[PDB]
Amino acid sequence: MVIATIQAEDHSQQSGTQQETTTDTGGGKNVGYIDAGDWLSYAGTPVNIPSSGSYLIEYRVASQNGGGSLTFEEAGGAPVHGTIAIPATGGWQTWTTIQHTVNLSAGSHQFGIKANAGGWNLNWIRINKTH
Ligand SMILES: O[C@@H]1[C@@H](O)[C@H](O[C@@H]2CO[C@@H](O[C@@H]3CO[C@@H](O[C@@H]4CO[C@@H](O)[C@H](O)[C@H]4O)[C@H](O)[C@H]3O)[C@H](O)[C@H]2O)OC[C@H]1O
Ligand SMILES: [Ca+2]
Ligand SMILES: [Ca+2]
Numbered sequence: 001m002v003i004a005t006i007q008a009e010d011h012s013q014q015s016g017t018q019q020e021t022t023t024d025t026g027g028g029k030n031v032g033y034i035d036a037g038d039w040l041s042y043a044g045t046p047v048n049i050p051s052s053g054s055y056l057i058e059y060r061v062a063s064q065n066g067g068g069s070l071t072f073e074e075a076g077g078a079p080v081h082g083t084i085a086i087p088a089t090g091g092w093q094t095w096t097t098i099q100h101t102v103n104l105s106a107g108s109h110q111f112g113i114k115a116n117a118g119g120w121n122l123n124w125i126r127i128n129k130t131h
């Protein structure tokens, strides 16, 4: 069951990135020009987690050459929830969905993403129940 879909471009604050038009399914925009140090805050749109436990986080990503990684966290940087490697997809607008699990406490969260290594674009993020 889906808890939230967050379009990557709908950040309340950011550093070092730029929006661009995406040709991915559904159109709209993606965040691009993501490099080490860059970040996206979704603190403006808190998401409610109904119960403590495991959640599946999905990211809609594109990467010409691979090598990227990100850290999913609360905005401001702590606690950190998890990290994920972003694979090469064949190009900047060739999209795939990647995923990992993290533990989240129940209640209102203000999420953020920190790029540890660049080379990827982000269309949206999705938070899902597991159990
Ligand atoms: O006396 C009564 C007033 O208190 C009441 O005012 C309402 C109070 O609630 C207001 O909504 C608030 C707005 O802030 C939200 O938290 C933010 C969530 O995003 C975060 O990024 C940010 O940092 C937080 O500050 C909070 O959840 C929400 O409840 C509302 O706008 C006011 O109208 O009005 C009725 C009076 O009788
Ligand atoms: Ca950048
Ligand atoms: Ca988008």
Ligand code: NA
Binding pocket: 090, 091, 092, 093, 094
């Ligand atoms: Na492409």
Ligand code: NA
Binding pocket: 034, 035, 036, 116, 117, 118, 119
């Ligand atoms: Na980089």
